[PDB]
Amino acid sequence: PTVVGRIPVLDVRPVVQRGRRPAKAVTGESFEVSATVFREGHDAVGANVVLRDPRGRPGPWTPMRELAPGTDRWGATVTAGETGTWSYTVEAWGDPVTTWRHHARIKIPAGLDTDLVLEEGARLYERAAADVPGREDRRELLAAVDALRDESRPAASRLAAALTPQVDAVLARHPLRDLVTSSDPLPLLVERERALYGAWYEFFPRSEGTPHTPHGTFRTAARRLPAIAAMGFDVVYLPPIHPIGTTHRKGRNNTLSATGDDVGVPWAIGSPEGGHDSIHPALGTLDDFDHFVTEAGKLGLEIALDFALQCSPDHPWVHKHPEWFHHRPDGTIAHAENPPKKYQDIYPIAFDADPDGLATETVRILRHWMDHGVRIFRVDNPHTKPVAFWERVIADINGTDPDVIFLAAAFTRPAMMATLAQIGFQQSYTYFTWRNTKQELTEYLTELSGEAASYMRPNFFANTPDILHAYLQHGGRPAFEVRAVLAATLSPTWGIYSGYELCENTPLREGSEEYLDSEKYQLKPRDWTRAAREGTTIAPLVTRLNTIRRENPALRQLRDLHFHPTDKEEVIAYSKRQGSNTVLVVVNLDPRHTQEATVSLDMPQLGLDWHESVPVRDELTGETYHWGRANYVRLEPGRTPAHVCTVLR
């Protein structure tokens, strides 16, 4: 056998790890399948995509087009359906009809071999008709055959009878394909909508207590859910909900010594009260948790638990499974680190003494929470545990429960971030919070919305308990407004950590990205009712952003994204599309000064001609404009962070 087929079809994309890992999609998501297709000689080729479902049933006829002249790169859009493992194949073929037409169009006017040329056409169309399954379609082609063969008519009219729009349509639907040649199948993993699309809210249940019981329970913390659902969130992300160690417990503002009242850090998991399969006694019981999950469910909220594979020194594993830790010559275990950050309250896990035991126990723990309605896990710092460990774990869990979603909380180098997504992580944290200028946003989002989108789904948290960017520190509320608009409109998954709404932006010190009085080390009661009454929250903006997302399919996908040029460095503009839904966003990235600019839209990229005018509505205001080629905007911090417009149709 030869590697190359009769009609070359090469380098089909997307491809992940040379075919050894699947490319990704979710139900209802469209993406481009592409290939290098060409043939020997000068005759024309055609190509098409055969997308097969998990039962092997092929999708509809999906012809490809050359993506740019002279490149031999061909593409077509496919749309994933039900969940499971799909496959895709590209078929390439000689297109004798396009070839014959091109030649006939020159030769008939120039009078060269006209009887021969026209009889050659007749024979192609006759072969075409043979394969057409409709009687009416077949009859149409055979009529053009007879007109092509009618030697009593002028050559120009015998030919014209074979170039009618009615024939065009039969051939476009059932074309004559020579020497059909197939690529080898490539795997596609299709997963549920929520893997790609959702709004996430993170908060600490323990902070939502009462005057008589400051440490919240699952029962008190459930009272906070209606407001989360009202802001249009879909996922609630909870930091670890397990007992918390006492040895080397950290105090307020990340101090080394806890006082007797100090609650400690939820990530310092485990005590004699229990480990990763237990509930912190001050949060209540497994039944209180079930209640919380149930109440979340009634409001359209799914729970994501933090899974942090690490231990306080009081975690049962320390004595029950010493081999799951790296011990130094004196028998002690070095606390975990992530330089320059030190984690004196925890031990990292070692994986090379008992990998089988760790995997078995990890999936046991996850299956336990899954039995209690948790179908999403936020995996803390997966880049400090082996890549293959996660590949094995995720494959074990998804093999019985493919709906489970894992989110990689890994802020690290690009190779590891990409690899984690490729080996199974449904979602990934990103460099979003460190992309704030227009150049940075434009470059980074072009990367995420391009080839990386075949294996990585990004979750744009505008802030996290560990990240209060200098942009929010110096920018105040107007910067909070900008970052929410950006996050919500540039990724189909975004989220915030409680307090973002209130523009909490006091750092631990200058040049730090830590919050002062960080919630990680203390109860942080917040007077939500007061903030709402006093209007010192951007909950309404957040609420509006999520409503717009729910009403505009373009914002529930990632790959279709285009940046339009403006004449001010502080003003960025982009559009996103999905069927007939087009959303156009203009943001002022200066949180401190009013900016005016001309936004010059790439009109063909919106499906419009250069001269056209198009009505839009700013969904932030209800205000309507008529925009085209070149549009004046004026964006005032405080009053207007951005325009978020839908194209009216």
Add this chain to the structure above:
Amino acid sequence: PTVVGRIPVLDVRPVVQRGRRPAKAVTGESFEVSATVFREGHDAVGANVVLRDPRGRPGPWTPMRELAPGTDRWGATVTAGETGTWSYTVEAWGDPVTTWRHHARIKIPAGLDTDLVLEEGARLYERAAADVPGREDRRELLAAVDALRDESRPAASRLAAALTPQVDAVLARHPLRDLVTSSDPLPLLVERERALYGAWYEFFPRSEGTPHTPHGTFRTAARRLPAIAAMGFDVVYLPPIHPIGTTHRKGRNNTLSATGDDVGVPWAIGSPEGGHDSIHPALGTLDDFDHFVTEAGKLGLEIALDFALQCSPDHPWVHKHPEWFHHRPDGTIAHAENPPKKYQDIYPIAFDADPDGLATETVRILRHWMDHGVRIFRVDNPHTKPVAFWERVIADINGTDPDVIFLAAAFTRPAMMATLAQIGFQQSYTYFTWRNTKQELTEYLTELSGEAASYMRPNFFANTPDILHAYLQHGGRPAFEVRAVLAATLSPTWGIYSGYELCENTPLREGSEEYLDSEKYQLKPRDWTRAAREGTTIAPLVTRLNTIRRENPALRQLRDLHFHPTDKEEVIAYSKRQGSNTVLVVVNLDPRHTQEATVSLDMPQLGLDWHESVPVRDELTGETYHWGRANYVRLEPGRTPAHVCTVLR
């Protein structure tokens, strides 16, 4: 099993067609094997390349280094040896010693846990020693272990005993590798030197005749060989040597009707006198050819024959194998085309009726010429025959005779060009003749010397019977000189078509790349002796260029190539290296005006510091200069096309 190993080693390169075709090299050629290598956590990794020969024997220890900070891309140079199919593997591992050293160097001076740190070192070095096969090497490591454990010495000196150059050398040669992880093997095809390196000369034997017999024979044309060898060429490329059809024979200057004297085009192969396995009667016999091949051999010249899989209408195949042609409804066979070029004197071959018969006959014909000492074929327009046909043919021929070299004469789109090389073509024609500005040469050669060098070996013909570039037409002799320097120094394979030496540059008409009175359609006798006497040939320059190439290993390879900036658009500068041989070239691409410039050398890329001065000799003149950071050149067309300097040691 998991796709990813314990220590990630990903995307090993070179790779061709995702591993389904081999990457290429020749005996003695060095190239970079690279991979993405990293681990979980913050400890250091190492990596190395295991190159295995056709018998499976691994090459030497070949450690890799990270190629640029923060990228996790690692590389090392390997060198191919004997011919055949090799394999290469990248091994990645935890490097605990580098990790421990880095930490020990901070902790011992700062007094933190010193007994614990040093004992951890001792245990590593003990594990190191276990795997060392030399008694003397082992004894060295065990000494540093004992010095590390000696609690009566200061901490600084217990540590210093483990950082000696003598320990460094044992560990550099036999390091402690944790969790060794291997990539899957990738195939390497290693071929003979000539596939990559050689100077080629093309000429038409028939043009080298006598006053009494103007049509040359193999016996008269042999007289021309000593001069070809004297110019330092290694390969003689002959246009087709077979009988030439009479029906539709073309006349002079590509006219449609031959007169009775007209000789026709050698590519119009076949008559009643014979086909592709015959000799044109006016060239002599198979014995005369053997004589020519023998005489070429004695002079260090190998013969490359043109193989053009096409027929005159008088070729025997037309009646013996009608099914090897596509016939139209009236029984005629459309002449071959290559738009806008028409080939009225030939028929193209059709491959879908009897692919087996065509492959069987093609290898038969090639084996016939191979029996007569032809081990190189220049394959005419392979892009008009199926890609898989060549893949099969080349695999069949190289399976018995791996030394045979095929050269793809395909000026076409990039995809097909690359594919032809990937499926087996040892050498490729290129876009060289259409790259004449500095930007064009720089861009194109960066492409050829980079990733494409793992599957394509370029043959830089400065001209061909079909290509007289406008640059040569308008530039005159100075342009001929520039293009020879460029071709000879930028590719390890280059060539010229006879007449190039004489600066024949009269086009058929303005805006054509055809020669007037093209040798393809007529005998073209040339007064070589006169041109040599009158100094109106650049044969001496050519002769010098090939001597320089034979004396400078840097110019006998392709991948090591760097462009150095100059401050004039018309002056280009580059260097090439191979062991301690460094060649530095500066060319004035303006053939009409004198150009002066400052050449600012990237000194680290020469293995030198910025401040260093280095002696060079212009091998064109014998003249010696001292060059550094910044060097003044003055290049005068006619006198000086270029400097071609060697770095003096």
